Amino acid sequence: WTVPTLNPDTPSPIFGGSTGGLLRKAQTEEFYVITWEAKKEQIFEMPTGGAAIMRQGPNLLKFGKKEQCLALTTQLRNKFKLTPCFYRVFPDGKVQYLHPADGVYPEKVNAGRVGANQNMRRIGQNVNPIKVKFSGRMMSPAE
Amino acid sequence: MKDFTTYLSTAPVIATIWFTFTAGLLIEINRYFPDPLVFSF
């Protein structure tokens, strides 16, 4: 498995428009694109409010927040058993593959992802804040 | 009627019965011994 490049020629679900879609944030800093392949034309709920019809085959959707994309991801996986992957798109044109970063979904293991932010102590084994006092920035003993 | 008497032994029913009893006892004490400001009898 390798990082898939976002195909921009992907169609979009049938949606009549809303007011919960993109804002100036998409034009300024970043927005999000979620893609999935549907087996049949089905009506799903938009996280922005409203009902859209996903097309048979590949479907592309734009969102201004990662939580929107993962809400739709969990809806498509739990109510439709699809396998969506979403990206972070910048106004520069730079696309950053995000969700199945390893290819598999993070609730399952893929044998090759490296563990991060794992404290190898108990949560009651943290030092007192008097030990991390004057650490430059204001810090928690968990570091 | 084992289940009915189990229902009557529930916390709200027992509380209602016990507090009706306590309030009635206090009310009858205050009817027959009215205005007890001090222990003098």
Partner: protein, 80 residues
Amino acid sequence: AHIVKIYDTCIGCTQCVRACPLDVLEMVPWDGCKASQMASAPRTEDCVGCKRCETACPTDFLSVRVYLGSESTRSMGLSY
């Protein structure tokens, strides 16, 4: 960003990763000196701080801990 630490009481139940609405956590093999899996937090720059992960952690005390740090556009969950 918010600080999401994971401690060595993790039992690999994967419920923290299932419950994260931002894909901040994942399950890594054999970093904890434990059974098969241990939880990780490689994407804490996307963490909003909902603490849905540590609402779903069954260990006592929590094996996943979210310490609310400095706010950003992603941490504050802004579509604008």
